[model samples]
Target: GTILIDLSPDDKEFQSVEEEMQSTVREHRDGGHAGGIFNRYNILKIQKVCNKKLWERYTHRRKEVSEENHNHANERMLFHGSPFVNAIIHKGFDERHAYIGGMFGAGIYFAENSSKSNQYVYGIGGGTGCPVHKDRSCYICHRQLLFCRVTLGKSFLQFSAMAHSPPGHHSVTGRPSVNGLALAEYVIYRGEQAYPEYLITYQIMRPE
Candidate 1:
């Protein structure tokens, strides 16, 4: 009793979903940066001038992913931005790829040197596995590559991610992919009563 139905790109049924994803992806792609680069080719031979409000951009996005209900928190909020999800959709997905419980059944992970670093890459990875990437970062990086998990958006995105041990759950667990959904599933798997429900769609940009 399993069937999947993905609406066309032009379908107005899920236009809101498409818009938010497109907007979040576009903003993330822009790297949250705007204006100009006055730094201009100055290799520093006789230059000593700089923007008085210097280093503002360095910590500009420092506190994006944290507790929800916060001012600019990312992961915990619906309609937030997710770099991993955006990249996956942009990279194109495998036709054989599938989702078990949508985004609800996934986990969340950000890039960093360690698992609990908390530095927060602002990007999230999937729980599934990826064969294309095989290495230490493979568990996280590769999984992120394989999952095209479902997500909703208004300004930001919330993707799925589950950390890899080492050789990755793919090589160890032999999963189709080590990808995953987040905390939504376990809590709302069959309960759909009290929810932050939203309508969305997935686009298949490549020819099968």
Candidate 2:
């Protein structure tokens, strides 16, 4: 079973997350720009996900991945944008649901910047050809991003895409300079190497 702890606006933990998201978005502002609108988002809710079974598996897998080093610097909190927030919350991150032809290959991708992650929330399209808002620009509401706890372990940086990690590494990091990728992104081949720790829901904000 999945337990979701809804964080109140006044909570210190919730404040910290909101602060970080706002700061990241401020620093990186090129996410939702199209036809006459530059989109930003105000976080509406933050839910702390508590899945004991997934946590157990993640920690166990962490040890196995960290065997190559003494520092155990395998864990990182990153952002993953997707339309299947419920599916991910229920079953954890699976590559089968991940998008194909990723810059880092056929694995689950995560980024450090919230704005960078915001670009992936486009799967919420409707059957109608018209935009969700009827305008050429669709400023969607309640779009979500997952703050994930990822185990990078021994990461191998690559300027090119590859389906699998190299002989010794557990993950692949796409280089920022190459392929017009302004931000570095991490991709974990195995689903157990990551856990969706938080579900952040936000609504679009535009400059007045």
Candidate 3:
């Protein structure tokens, strides 16, 4: 169902991304992390689906966002890393964990409502998070965007985005800067619920 636009199957950048997806799936299969509800074969199928989604989704986004600036369209995306913990608070939230989310920019969380049927599309900041509370704009990444979304089969969705870390400042003296990571995310959330619903999220530079 995912259609790739603005990219040819022969394009180098496109080919590289496709290669990475295959590599990711291969590594996950070799790692032997699938079982029970999460089977390797199922995961393999889902990964391919997700791989198509990401490539397609970002191609559209890049066209829209980089409009009038197509000069950089050929530029490869810069890769950054953010931990899975920042995307959700499974154990609970703290200043550190909360702060971590900000460092990487904005994100989306797939949360369940009080009832069992509704799911919430949680966006970062403005009506959700605090991206402007700190003095140095700490945890407040402006103009951040959700670059892509990948749905893995029936219940899994991975959202990737950006957060440009401030260039320089003070993290210690309570002054202005606390160096940050301009990271990419792979937040996996179960989109559809079953008899036993879950809020599980696993990700990073790697997703298995």
Best by lDDT: 2
Model 1: residues with Cα > 4 Å off, grouped in runs: 26-129, 135-208
Q: Using TM-score as the measure, what is the rank order of every candidate, best first? A: 2, 1, 3
* Candidate 2 deviant stretches above 4 angstroms: 26-39, 124-137, 159-162, 178-181
Q: Tens digits of per-residue lDDT for model 2 on 116-192?
A: 67666654222221236544234554567889899998899886522567778899887766435355778888888
lDDT of 3 by residue, 1-208 (tens): 3321344556674455444332322222113222111111111111111233334444554453345344333222211111332232122212322223542333222211110001111222222322354221122222211112322121112233222212321011111132222122222221110011112221112225
List the candidates' TM-scores in order. 0.23, 0.83, 0.22
- The candidate maximizing TM-score is 2
Q: What TM-score should be assigned to candidate 3?
A: 0.22
lDDT of 1 by residue, 93-130 (tens): 22112223233232232211111111112322322212
Q: Residue 4's C-alpha lDDT in candidate 1? A: 25
Evaluated at residue 57, the lDDT of candidate 1 is 24
Model 3 residue 47 CA deviation (Å) reads 11
Candidate 3 Cα misplacement greater than 4 A, ranges:
1-50, 85-208
Angstrom error at residue 129, model 3: 25
